[PDB]
RNA sequence: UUCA
RNA sequence: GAGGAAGAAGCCCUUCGGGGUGUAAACUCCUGAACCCGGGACGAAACCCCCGACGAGGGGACUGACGGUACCGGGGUAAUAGCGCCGGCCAACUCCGUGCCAGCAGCCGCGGUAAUACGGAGGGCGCGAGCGUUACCCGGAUUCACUGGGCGUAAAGGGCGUGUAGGCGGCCUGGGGCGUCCCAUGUGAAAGACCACGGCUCAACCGUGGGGGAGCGUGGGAUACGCUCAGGCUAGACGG
RNA sequence: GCUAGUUGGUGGGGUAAUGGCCCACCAAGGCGACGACGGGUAGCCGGUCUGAGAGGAUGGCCGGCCACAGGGGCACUGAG
């Protein structure tokens, strides 16, 4: 069975590419509080459809790039930018963590 | 600590440190002497217990006691060191093996003889 | 080596009689008859009240002591019952009446356990009908016992097997005085064993 | 028909104007290995009133032990001031798996297979206390049965 | 070019193979892909030779080649047969 | 606010009983009147029953103990000698059937949440199943 | 002053 | 190996009456590792050859390093014992030497003239073709605590807020079925581990057979709790 | 905090074959506190030792995979 995998576009900044984060959730091993993981995965979108907020899901595929090895299947709902924020915040957060800041 | 700092940074594990570095861990180790005085204990005890600098392969120079009634240990005495802590000399980590190399075994020592390397005496 | 050495001294240090020489061990001379104490230049005076680990070492000394058997073998055969199902304690006392040494001191054919060990060695013992000179040797429930063909007719076997005709023998067991066989139909219970010791103590001295 | 069992005996001295003055202390057990064992600690000017004393002490303090044959019915855990005791039935043919202390009440108490452990300060004078609650607490099918029942 | 040959079991002096089914290149004592008897030559047990005939005559059907010795052996167990 | 109403419950008997209480209210929740069935089914508590303390709905729980005592200390031998939540928010426990805890040699119970509803250790054992482990009780 |  | 004294000599101890080493030895009788001689392996039946059909079958020959070894039968001598400990933990005590020396020492601690702790001796305790030592791993150590710990004074609450990420989330109903649970099924090499039989005289070693299971994949099923999406509620919160 | 083969696109080249594997040209992109990058250390596993277990420690023999053949680079031949 080809992986087939479900996350949310969060970039539609490549030529017919989207990146797609797919959130993993289980009970963690020795502790086993139920733990939330995640990661992106670089899909193939060849008629540059799919667009931010959506989501979809994410097929197995031949290889089509150094880091792509995935295209997108199909798409579930849509729009829902609520995630897409969720992951740009935190990737804001970055900036104040080092040797200066960032207010909150 | 809760679960989730747990999670979060979980447990350290608790590395022991050696008290014998006589490098690769390995049970014994040879050098030579490079001096050969005699110390005095502490605390309550005294007495002249005799030590010895030693050059060793491990590229190392430490103190060790020498075991025994009486020994032959001079300037450029070639050893092997073995590693016992002597409570009565802070600073004194490892034992001179007695029987091995240049550290003639204890004389006419009759019970723990294996130890101060001593041949059996025959029963005439 | 098994042991060689001071015998009727073992006896004494457990304070308690050993059967370990057989026809003098029984008449007024095992020393444990006007001697009772233990060997020593100190067996005399009282001795202190001893650590529960004292006391569970001699009874672990009084069984080996008893079976002749170096702690080597002991301690495996322990292990061996340890493992195997039903109270790991009586089957241990099970396995070491099972050693053909021993046996062939229940059967008669040796007065005495060291006795009988040099008689298996020597070859002078067979098992189902072929020769065995290992005393460890584990005898299971319908081999056949009998004395050597050819040593049969030895001297010591007739003197030892001859004290036999009359005297009965461990209901476990079963001999023929005659043809000079013998069989084991079973592992003995612990109710068969007269003992002079108390297992549990063993048990307790390994678990430590 | 009561076998007494001597858990340990100490010396202790309270000072005083021109020395030190003693005073021996005793814990013992008393046990009919029928499932009915009772603790006494006993203190006085010489070890053997000390002991006499522990004695009399444990008969005033019995307890009954709910054997299940050999072992307890179930498993406890009793925490006594800083010390911890664990009790968790065993089958036959193990014996008793304990420290001195926890053996040998549980021993005249007429336990013959039984696990355990000391955690926490391994204090006999608690520990014995420990076990004592332990088994003053255990119950039985019946017992919970008739507690259970309205 | 797959094989039905002996590998090594059992100790020193105490030969026992297993007839099996493997690449003509891996150790003799290697990773087999399947085992389809045993052989013990010295024949202490009376049962000393078993070969499932149903399998080898299948490996036989698709290329694999027995040695010489494990086609003696596999032969006994009438795996050539045909009466 | 409650992050455990379940814990909260548990803890009201727990602590109600402690100073020997007749009855002692508790929010109403679905999920905690299922586990009061089965307290009351095992016979650890006398029963319960809904109520409307001041509008808000409630569950009185009518707690049971032992008989009055010899010597000194005459309280009587608790029913619930002890009850511990097992799965808690932050740390869920869950269980196959063959991973099913035997509370206190059968003496106790373990009241689990199962795809097919709140039931006892061997309640959920009987009928093959496991899930989260809500708390266990004796 | 050390050691009991 | 079985006998063998109210008990040798020596050695140690002694209140000198005696005790210990101890049935231990001597000695008597029995067996007979070593070693001598005789026989002597399985492992090796194929490829090949003839018949038949260069098939199936059936006959036939060759080939053993190990090794004259294992094993068998006969003969046959009483024929190695060491090492570590004996203050407590921790089984085992007494004399003499030494006098904070010489030395021991895992930890606690012994030695300053009566040392069961040093060194010797006698005796004793453990093991035994081994016994000790050092080095290293896990254990005890719930002494990094998931099972299974703590933070007033023992080590430990951040000097205080605000608040980002994250963690956690009251009451009712419905959809989904991600976590969770269930059935089925594929996978989970051999060896090892467990069990039962077996082959070497036993065992170690070995063979045969048996039972495993988590994890992951696939197909179904359940929906209490958690998650999610919908919609309500007012008891948390905020507002008037 | 790291990154211009970096991330992707188009067309090629190359190979048994996908691929920034390598080119030409065009896009700005890609990764990171669910720890990028950097430093240290280490072949991985079946298994082994230990432990009541969870866990800890290991990876010699033997079986599987990988990597290397004085150190660095390279291609030829060939089913490989
Ligand atoms: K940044
Ligand atoms: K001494
Ligand atoms: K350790
Ligand atoms: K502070
Ligand atoms: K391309
Ligand atoms: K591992
Ligand atoms: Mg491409
Ligand atoms: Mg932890
Ligand atoms: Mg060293
Ligand atoms: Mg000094
Ligand atoms: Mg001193
Ligand atoms: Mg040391
Ligand atoms: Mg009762
Ligand atoms: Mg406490
Ligand atoms: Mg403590
Ligand atoms: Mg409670
Ligand atoms: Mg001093
Ligand atoms: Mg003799
Ligand atoms: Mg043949
Ligand atoms: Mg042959
Ligand atoms: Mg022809
Ligand atoms: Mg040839
Ligand atoms: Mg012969
Ligand atoms: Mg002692
Ligand atoms: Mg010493
Ligand atoms: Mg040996
Ligand atoms: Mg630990
Ligand atoms: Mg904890
Ligand atoms: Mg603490
Ligand atoms: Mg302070
Ligand atoms: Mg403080
Ligand atoms: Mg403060
Ligand atoms: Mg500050
Ligand atoms: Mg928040
Ligand atoms: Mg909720
Ligand atoms: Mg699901
Ligand atoms: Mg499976
Ligand atoms: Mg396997
Ligand atoms: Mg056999
Ligand atoms: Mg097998
Ligand atoms: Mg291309
Ligand atoms: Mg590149
Ligand atoms: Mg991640
Ligand atoms: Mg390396
Ligand atoms: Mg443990
Ligand atoms: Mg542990
Ligand atoms: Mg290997
Ligand atoms: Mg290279
Ligand atoms: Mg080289
Ligand atoms: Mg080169
Ligand atoms: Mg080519
Ligand atoms: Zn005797």
Same mark, same amino acid.
């Given at each position: 069975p080809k992986k087939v995998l479900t996350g949310v576009?969060?970039?539609? *900044?490549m030529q017919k590419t989207v990146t797609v984060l797919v959130e993993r959730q289980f009970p963690h091993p020795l502790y086993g509080k139920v733990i939330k993981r995640s990661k992106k995965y670089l899909a193939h979108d060849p008629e540059e459809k799919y667009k931010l907020g959506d989501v979809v899901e994410i097929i197995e595929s031949?290889?089509?790039? *150094?880091? *792509?090895?995935?295209?997108?299947?199909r798409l579930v709902?849509?729009?829902?930018?609520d995630l897409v924020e969720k992951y740009l915040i935190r990737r804001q957060n970055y900036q104040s963590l080092s040797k200066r800041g960032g207010k909150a | 600590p809760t679960i989730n700092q747990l999670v979060r940074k979980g447990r350290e594990k608790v590395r022991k440190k050696s008290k014998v570095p006589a490098l690769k861990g390995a049970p014994f180790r040879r050098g030579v002497c490079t001096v050969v005085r005699t110390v005095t204990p502490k605390k309550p005890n005294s007495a002249l217990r005799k030590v010895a600098k030693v050059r060793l392969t491990s590229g190392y120079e430490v103190t060790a006691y020498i075991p025994g009634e009486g020994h032959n240990l001079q300037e450029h005495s070639v050893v092997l060191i073995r590693g016992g802590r002597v409570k009565d000399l802070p600073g004194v980590r490892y034992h001179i093996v007695r029987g091995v190399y240049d550290a003639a075994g204890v004389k006419d020592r009759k019970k723990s003889r294996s130890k101060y390397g001593t041949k059996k005496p025959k029963e005439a | 080596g098994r042991y060689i050495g001071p015998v009727c001294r073992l006896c004494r240090r457990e304070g308690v009689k050993l059967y370990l020489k057989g026809e003098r061990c029984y008449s007024p001379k095992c020393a444990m008859e006007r001697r009772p104490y233990p060997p020593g230049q100190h067996g005399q005076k009282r001795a202190r009240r001893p650590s529960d680990y004292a006391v569970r070492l001699r009874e672990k000394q009084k069984l080996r002591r008893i079976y002749g058997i170096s702690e080597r073998q002991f301690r495996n055969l322990f292990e061996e019952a340890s493992k195997?199902?039903?109270?790991t304690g009586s089957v241990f006392l099970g396995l070491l009446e099972s050693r053909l040494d021993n046996v062939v001191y229940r059967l008669g054919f040796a007065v005495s356990r060291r006795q009988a060990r040099q008689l298996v060695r020597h070859g002078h013992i067979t098992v189902n009908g072929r020769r065995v000179d290992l005393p460890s040797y584990r005898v299971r429930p319908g081999d056949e016992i009998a004395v050597a063909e050819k040593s049969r007719n030895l001297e010591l076997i007739r003197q030892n097997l001859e004290a036999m005709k009359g005297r009965k023998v461990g209901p476990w067991l079963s001999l023929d005085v005659e043809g000079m066989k013998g069989k084991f139909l079973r592992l003995p219970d612990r109710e068969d064993l007269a003992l002079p010791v108390n297992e549990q103590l063993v048990i307790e001295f390994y678990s430590r | 028909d009561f076998e007494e069992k001597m858990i340990l005996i100490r010396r202790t001295a309270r000072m005083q104007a021109g020395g030190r003055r003693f005073r021996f202390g005793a814990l013992v057990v008393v046990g009919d290995r029928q499932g009915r064992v009772g603790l006494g600690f006993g203190k006085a000017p010489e070890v053997p009133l000390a002991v006499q004393k522990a004695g009399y002490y444990a008969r005033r303090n019995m307890v009954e032990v709910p054997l299940q044959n050999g072992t307890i019915p179930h498993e406890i855990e009793v925490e006594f001031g800083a010390s911890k005791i664990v009790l968790k039935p065993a089958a036959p043919g193990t014996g008793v798996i304990a420290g001195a202390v926890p053996r040998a009440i549980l021993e005249l108490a007429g336990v013959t297979d039984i696990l355990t452990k000391e955690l926490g300060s391994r204090n006999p004078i608690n520990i014995a206390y420990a076990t004592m609650e332990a088994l003053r607490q255990l119950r039985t099918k019946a017992d919970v049965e008739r507690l259970r029942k309205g | 070019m797959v094989k039905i040959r002996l590998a090594r079991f059992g100790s020193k002096h105490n030969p026992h193979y297993r007839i099996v089914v493997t690449?003509?290149?891996?150790?003799?004592?290697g990773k087999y892909i399947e085992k389809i008897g045993y052989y013990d030559?010295?024949?202490?047990?009376?049962?000393w030779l078993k070969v499932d005939v149903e399998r080898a005559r299948y490996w036989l059907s698709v290329g694999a080649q027995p040695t010489d010795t494990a086609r003696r052996l596999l032969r006994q167990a009438g795996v050539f047969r045909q009466e | 606010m409650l992050t455990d109403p379940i814990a909260d419950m548990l803890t009201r008997i727990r602590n109600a009983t402690r100073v020997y209480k007749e009855s002692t209210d508790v929010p109403a929740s679905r999920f905690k009147e299922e586990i009061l069935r089965i307290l009351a089914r095992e016979g650890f508590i006398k029963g319960y029953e809904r109520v409307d303390v001041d509008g808000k709905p409630y569950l009185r729980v009518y707690l049971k103990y032992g008989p009055r005592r010899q010597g000194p200390d005459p309280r009587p031998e608790q029913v619930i000698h002890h009850i511990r939540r097992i799965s808690k928010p932050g740390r869920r426990v869950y269980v196959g059937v063959k991973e099913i805890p035997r509370v206190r040699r059968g003496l106790g119970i373990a009241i689990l949440s199962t795809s097919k509803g709140v039931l006892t250790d061997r309640e959920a054992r009987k009928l093959g199943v496991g899930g989260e482990l809500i708390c266990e009780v004796w």
């Open positions: 576009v969060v970039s539609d *900044k031949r290889p089509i790039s *150094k880091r *792509k090895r995935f295209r997108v299947l709902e849509s729009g829902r930018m | - | 195997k199902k039903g109270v | - | 690449d003509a290149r891996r150790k003799r004592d030559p010295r024949k202490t047990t009376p049962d | -």
